[PDB]
Write a protein that binds this ligand. Sequence first.
Ligand code: NI
Length: 341
Amino acid sequence: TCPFYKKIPGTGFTVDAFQYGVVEGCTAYFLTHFHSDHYAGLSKHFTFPVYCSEITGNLLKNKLHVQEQYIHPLPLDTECIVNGVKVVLLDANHCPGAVMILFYLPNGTVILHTGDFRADPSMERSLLADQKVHMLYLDTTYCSPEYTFPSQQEVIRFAINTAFEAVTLNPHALVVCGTYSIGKEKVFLAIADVLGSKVGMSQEKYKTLQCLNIPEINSLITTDMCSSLVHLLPMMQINFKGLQSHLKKCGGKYNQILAFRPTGWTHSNKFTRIADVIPQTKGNISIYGIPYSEHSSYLEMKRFVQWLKPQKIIPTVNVGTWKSRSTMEKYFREWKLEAGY
Ligand code: NI
């Protein structure tokens, strides 16, 4: 059964609630982004209206074969009327096509559902600036002060510099980047751009990338692995055994692999700066874990919430334990007392 924090009161609406069968009283199903914990349950047999971004709708139609007549893509930053209720979709600074959703309830309540997001000051100048928000349904993935990580820009600088150094020292090195979902495309696109290569990948991953409206993409990606010196592989194969095996398959074109695993946070964040990151090495293979996050840090999250000044917060992540729930509630109270709302 659908949990309360996926239901929007005073509407017929649910958010990211496709794995519960037919939800009692739901007249429209919203999907914030195409990640499997959120789309779980959609297919060609789904016959209710799905509301989402244009990019999410491309992925629904092509990857899950949902029928066109049930996909309702909406433009961003535009007031739209859905089953008699005004809504707006805003960029969530998560993966491609990810949105936050503002609902203007008929009784005057305004609700923001962040979906998954990486808070940014740029959000303080969207259509959020223009009115009061009563209730916030918040992505609390990293809601604890130990979660610090660098900007995306610093992490991409590290990766480009690392890859360009290695391949310039050894023109026979291969770069490999791990992936298991959409998001984090900048990592592999930035490295391929500095090396003057396309990124090579499986037909299934190429298909997924062609649904994303990224400009000049035919220029950056390919399925011809032989023509590429940056390869994308499943995240599970980014280990010494999986990479040794891949190197065998390249037929003596390469004699070294430099591989990247973009993770979210790991505890090496608490001690080490990005500058200082080192790989694990075995023989002619090196693996770098880089902290490229598409979720808010604790400090980014706090700044957003203290700016927005909601009257009530409903966490959507880490809600399954009493210790997590109590921790989060304590931070929300600190933030409110410090800012004075
Ligand atoms: Ni996500």
